[PDB]
A paper describes a structure:
Here we sought structural insights into the human immune recognition of fHbp, a key antigen in the two licensed MenB vaccines. Antibodies to fHbp elicit protection through complement-mediated bactericidal activity. We define a molecular signature that allows a vaccine-elicited human mAb to cross-react with the three different variants of fHbp and importantly, to induce complement-dependent killing responses against MenB strains harboring fHbp antigens from variants 1, 2, or 3.
However, superposition reveals that while most of the CDR loops do not change their conformation, there is a difference in the VH CDR3 loop conformation upon complex formation. In the complex, Gly104 establishes polar and water-mediated contacts with fHbp residues Asn215 and Gln216.
Author numbering:
A (entry chain A): 1 to 229
B (entry chain B): 2 to 216
The structure:
């Protein structure tokens, strides 16, 4: 299987240098161009340029040539993208990808790495608090119960949330992060499950925030409320 | 220097509709043109290369046409899972392979009312001195929804924020969270916390409420 696996999300300050990586596998590294593509969240794809591992032939779009350097390490079949001095405006997701080509037809981009989110900021990282959103009658209808985790007060993006270490994916809604007036992000991840499973099935959200090395597993336990005094 | 102009920037269509996306090049580029599909939170995926050649594994409802400076991506029978942003790209230049601006394709489906659920603050969060109340609107359509908070029947403003998911790839609905955040001290001054939801799918507004202390 042809794969490109990129390094994790980064928080850096303006003026710092940064090198992000893209590990290629499953194909002959020196036979294909590697390409780099920028995307600001919710914006379009931007071609940055390409580098060929066989001779480190690097092509840069004019928008990026002054500021970024492509390189490779053939012995580890890894491609690199390096800034010498980051700016706030460099905040974006960065994709690496292979260039592919059938016969003499013009090439296309694929497969792709999963992208590396780079945030350039003066602010220090803050790790999230994780709180249960417990299923109850207030979150139940028609034999379905909703439950979740609140992932509150972190910086920068991203956090990942899985349920039951990935076994539970149907009915999951992990909401886009939204800024609070504190300047910190918050989101909830919710899932709907059969209400009859609540006594039987354990539900755990697995939250990871790489920039702060925060990894939390939160059991979410059902609540029963008699609504009496 | 080849500029790719893509149109429209967004569109909406019903399941089964024929969708047409156009890409124009600032100069002729023969058939050196690719189309990609990018779903939310994922890397793009090539659909078509060389203007009209369909990639293996791509459904036959996708087709590319054109040559020179005008190209078209056609989805012949739009499916819910086709919700995505589509991009063209020229590969005629010497490795200066620029993309079009993207076309966001959204699905029109029938009105669907939200399921409304409410979550009081956790005891763990209250320990830490803050109180977040979460109102969840699940699987509704259209995206427009009005969510109001009332605390002891007093309408709140300025202490809540909303987040909405992207359209679901299977049923084309939205889900939305509205989170009311108060200090623990402010939360403990009141009893009745209620989220009131107004939506096309509801004949009248739905309120979900709880009483602080009821558990």
């Amino acid at each position: 299987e042809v794969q490109l696996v990129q390094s994790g999300a980064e928080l850096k300050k303006p003026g710092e240098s940064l090198k992000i990586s893209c590990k290629a596998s499953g194909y002959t590294f020196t036979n294909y161009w590697v390409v780099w593509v920028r995307q600001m969240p919710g914006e379009g794809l931007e071609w940055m340029g390409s580098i060929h591992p066989r001779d480190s032939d690097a092509r840069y779009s004019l928008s990026f040539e002054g500021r970024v350097t492509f390189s490779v390490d053939k012995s580890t079949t890894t491609a690199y993208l390096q800034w010498s001095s980051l700016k706030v405006s460099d905040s974006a997701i960065y994709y690496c990808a292979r260039l592919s080509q059938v016969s003499g037809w013009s090439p296309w981009v694929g497969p792709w790495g999963q992208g590396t989110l780079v945030t350039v900021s003066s602010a220090s990282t803050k790790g999230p608090s994780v709180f249960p959103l417990a299923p109850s009658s207030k979150s139940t209808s028609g034999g379905t119960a909703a439950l979740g985790c609140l992932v509150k007060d972190y910086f920068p993006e991203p956090v990942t949330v899985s349920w039951n270490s990935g076994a539970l994916t149907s009915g999951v809604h992990t909401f886009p992060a939204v800024l609070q007036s504190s300047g910190l992000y918050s989101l909830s991840s919710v899932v709907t499950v059969p209400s009859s499973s609540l006594g039987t099935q354990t539900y755990i959200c697995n939250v990871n925030h790489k920039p702060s090395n925060t990894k939390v597993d939160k059991k979410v336990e059902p609540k029963s409320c008699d609504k009496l005094e | 220097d080849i500029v790719m102009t893509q149109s429209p920037s967004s569109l909406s269509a019903s399941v089964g509709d024929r969708v047409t996306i156009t890409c124009r090049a600032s100069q002729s580029i023969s058939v050196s043109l690719n189309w990609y599909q990018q779903k939310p939170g994922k890397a793009p995926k090539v659909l078509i290369y060389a203007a009209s050649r369909l990639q293996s594994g791509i459904p036959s409802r996708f087709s590319g046409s054109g040559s020179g400076s005008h190209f078209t991506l056609t989805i012949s029978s739009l499916q819910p899972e086709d919700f995505a942003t589509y991009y063209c790209q020229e590969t005629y230049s010497d490795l200066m392979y620029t993309f079009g601006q993207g076309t966001k394709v959204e699905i029109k489906r029938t009105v669907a009312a939200p399921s409304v659920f409410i979550f009081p603050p956790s005891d763990e969060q209250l320990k830490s001195g803050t109180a977040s109340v979460v109102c969840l609107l699940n699987n509704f359509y259209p995206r427009e929804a009005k969510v109001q908070w009332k605390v002891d029947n007093a309408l709140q403003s300025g202490n809540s924020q909303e987040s909405v998911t992207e359209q679901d790839s299977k049923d084309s609905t939205y889900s939305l969270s509205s989170t009311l955040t108060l200090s623990k001290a402010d939360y403990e001054k009141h009893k009745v916390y209620a989220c009131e939801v107004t939506h096309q799918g509801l004949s009248s507004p739905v309120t979900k409420s709880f009483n602080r202390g009821e558990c």
